[PDB]
Symmetry: C2
Amino acid sequence: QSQINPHFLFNTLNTVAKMAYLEDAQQTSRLIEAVAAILRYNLGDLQRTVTLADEVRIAREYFFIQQTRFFDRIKFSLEAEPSCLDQPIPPLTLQPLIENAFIHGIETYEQGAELSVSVFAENGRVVVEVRDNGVGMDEQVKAELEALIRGEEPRTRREQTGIGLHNVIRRLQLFYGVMDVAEIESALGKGTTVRLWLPRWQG
Amino acid sequence: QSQINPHFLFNTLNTVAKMAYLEDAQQTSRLIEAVAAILRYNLGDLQRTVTLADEVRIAREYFFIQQTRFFDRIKFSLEAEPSCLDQPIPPLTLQPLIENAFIHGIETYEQGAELSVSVFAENGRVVVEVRDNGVGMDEQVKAELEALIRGEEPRTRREQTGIGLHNVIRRLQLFYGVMDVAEIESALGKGTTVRLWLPRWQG
């Protein structure tokens, strides 16, 4: 099941945000504003169309929140070519990749994790690279993702966080009408790069 | 899917709670503490055993949050016999009933909604009554719940908030080993009472 009520949670965070304003808690207000922005975006219609600029805005809010809590354990980097940010894309494409890389890092390092996001053009495609310096993703997990990218449906398993990497790939494939929307680069001790290859759609 | 990450949300609320303390935002801190308590409880193991006292504690946090936002639209009432609160019960039994009654009320009234919770003993059973003064629940919905209470599985429908009333009933039936764990009292214009009838289990 889903053991919580997200709409109650959003309304409650707005009540907290109102009280923080009333008490002039300026730094608290900024944090609530960031998590409110993420929650609002994730409660939107999953089948709407956004642009990469919206995905990157949400990524900045996420980095702002995590930097507040983890400032000396992990380093965040975000770079983007502006001409790429008008790319139409399904919402909640980038966040699952970033959360994957963040868990990888916090799970590999006491101090020293790195998470980098890069968005750039390459020969007719928009590349979105999410890189971490973790221990490397599991080989069976990687194989199953690569099979999905090629079009083969992976093994169904019981108890099939939130949107995972498989759902992101599937939504990109249906959105753009092409299967080869991603590649994974990983090796023991040398981290993980998930690289999206999105057909450049000026509009 | 579930379009949000609850563990990220809980960790973030703890970061907000830390900042509220650092800025001496006392009323903000109290609200965060309440929603943190609810979120922590709802992320627990659904198959653990709690007591009615735990369910009532969470209900008070919920009323505290909703009273802050809705103080002149709805009146909350909570009464309980203390000897009943050691009753073992599945977690997240009471909250779905209360959220049902709250939506009923906020949807029927601009001002004047009432939501009452009562817990008392009656001939070998612990009664949990959740009452609202709304317009009455839909007759087909009520019929399907009563069928489930009798043991007949209702019609399966696609896109089958959070835990609903059907899941609460099913979990109570499996927990106590009896089917007749609830009754619904509702009529157009005269509100809704959901009444749980729990076998008194001293231990």
